[PDB]
Amino acid sequence: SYYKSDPLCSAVLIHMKELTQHNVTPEDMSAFRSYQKKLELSETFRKNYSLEDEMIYYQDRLVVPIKQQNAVMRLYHDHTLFGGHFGVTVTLAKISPIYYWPKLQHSIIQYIRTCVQCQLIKSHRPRLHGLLQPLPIAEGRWLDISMDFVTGLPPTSNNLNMILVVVDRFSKRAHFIATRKATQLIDLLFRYIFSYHGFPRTITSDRDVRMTADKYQELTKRLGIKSTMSSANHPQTDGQSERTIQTLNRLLRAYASTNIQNWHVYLPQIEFVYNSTPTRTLGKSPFEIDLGYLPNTPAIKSDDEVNARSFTAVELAKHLKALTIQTKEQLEHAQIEMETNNNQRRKPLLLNIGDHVLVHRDAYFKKGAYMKVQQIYVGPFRVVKKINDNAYELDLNSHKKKHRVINVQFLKKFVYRP
DNA sequence: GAGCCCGTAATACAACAGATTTTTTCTCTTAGTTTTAAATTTTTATATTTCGTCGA
DNA sequence: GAGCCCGTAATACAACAAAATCCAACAAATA
DNA sequence: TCGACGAAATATAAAAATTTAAAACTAAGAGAAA
DNA sequence: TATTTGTTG
DNA sequence: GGTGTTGTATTACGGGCTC
DNA sequence: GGTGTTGTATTACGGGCTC
């Protein structure tokens, strides 16, 4: 039960094979590509096709007619003759030692994008699927605020359990919100610690139940506060707070190495140390990014001046304007530097309407659902809206899934074939 | 240089790195409880609505 | 080219990516 | 085809006196999701 | 001799 | 509307000397 | 004695044409 026991006088290679035969030319519809290929063969000298008793082949490899292309690549890709659904390299190593197939690599990668199980099972670095495209930089001071918290720490005396952080996107000002892992009184403690400065414009946070929080969201809609609400298991958007708790974790380890179970005393020292230390992407201390009144003043900084903003009373407007201008251009510099050092391999994905994208078992099933060697056979979903440049909402075929926003790091767009 | 086709063929990039239950609120869904007010009678004069009928 | 000192100063590279239970099973420690 | 009347339906304020929902109010039970 | 308790894929 | 982001050793580029 | 390692899209380099 072997193949190639069939003559085909109507295919692309007929023009190539009549270079010796010159007998019959029964071309088909859309066979004008064969005419152009024969013209290119005529103006060049690459004649290596061998014609031996109906076996027309290349120098050592069997050229296959285009009628049975899919049959051959399915035979050497599926388990009919022990393929195994591998990549283009193993498929070439199975086919190219035996067959030639002009533009074989493009045909094989097209088949990889065609075969459904390879789309659902393979990953092929599904963490580089969209550009960086960071947050818009800022406005006037204390208008954008980043919100997140680490769920659990070694508990203190039974009054405090975990640390919440507030750092603004502009100035990156540390904060010490020590919660109890909380209730609807989140707005009480949160209000007491941001309203020390004032009400922001948008909150960059995750889809956490203390902030998804239909009771708390309506408060923000009434008050005039937006909510970015980073999607399920995509904590990258929170950013400044995540980077702060990275710096806080080192600081908390430093100040509580031998002093576990009472770190709530040292937490204001943690935030004050974070506040007094200059950063890199802005080059100035977060006091200086705000009203520059580093109160410790161990020594005067470089370019010695008055450096006493307490003496200035009415002229603070020009000083804050100057700080705002230089910090805004520094934020733009940080944005472009991040975009340069990150997008060296980040391939974009821009669809925005009418596709059948997937979600490869991350933010689709539960974060608490165990990942194992169980098959990854998420069905072909649909996309109806372009919610952002780096995400697309889906019509999750479930009860509700409680969210339908999927960042591009889980999509891996499905492609059909007739 | 300058590009193009195509055919091979190198090429850095990332996955294998014990896996699962909890922890703390929240938010639909769906079955059980509780307090309370309401379906047909007398009735009494008042008035207006809407049928219902009758008359020349 | 050719290298060196020194003084700044850019520069990719990785950490924040929820936290903490055991599962199964080796061998030490008493009583 | 305009006039002429009869008559149930309500409120009404009590005392009452058996059945019927019936919608707030709890309380599992799943499903999220840092 | 059963119930522990260090560490490790 | 809504989607990364800085801390850190490490390393690259100008004044001043030998040319 | 004892300590990474390949699968995979992706991309870079020679024959043959225009020069």
Curated annotation (Swiss-Prot):
Outline the segment boundaries, as ranges, of region: Integrase-type zinc finger-like: 79-118
UniProt site positions, description: Cleavage:
S10, A11
Annotated Integrase catalytic domain ranges read 132-294
- Positions contributing to Mg(2+) 3 binding: D148, D206
The domain of life for this entry's organism is Eukaryota
**Protein name per its UniProtKB record:** Integrase p58
Please tell me the species this chain comes from.
Saccharomyces cerevisiae (strain ATCC 204508 / S288c) (Baker's yeast)
Higher taxonomy: Eukaryota, Fungi, Dikarya, Ascomycota, Saccharomycotina
**What gene codes for this chain?**
TY3B-G
Q: Which residues of the full protein are shown?
A: 1028 to 1448 of 1547
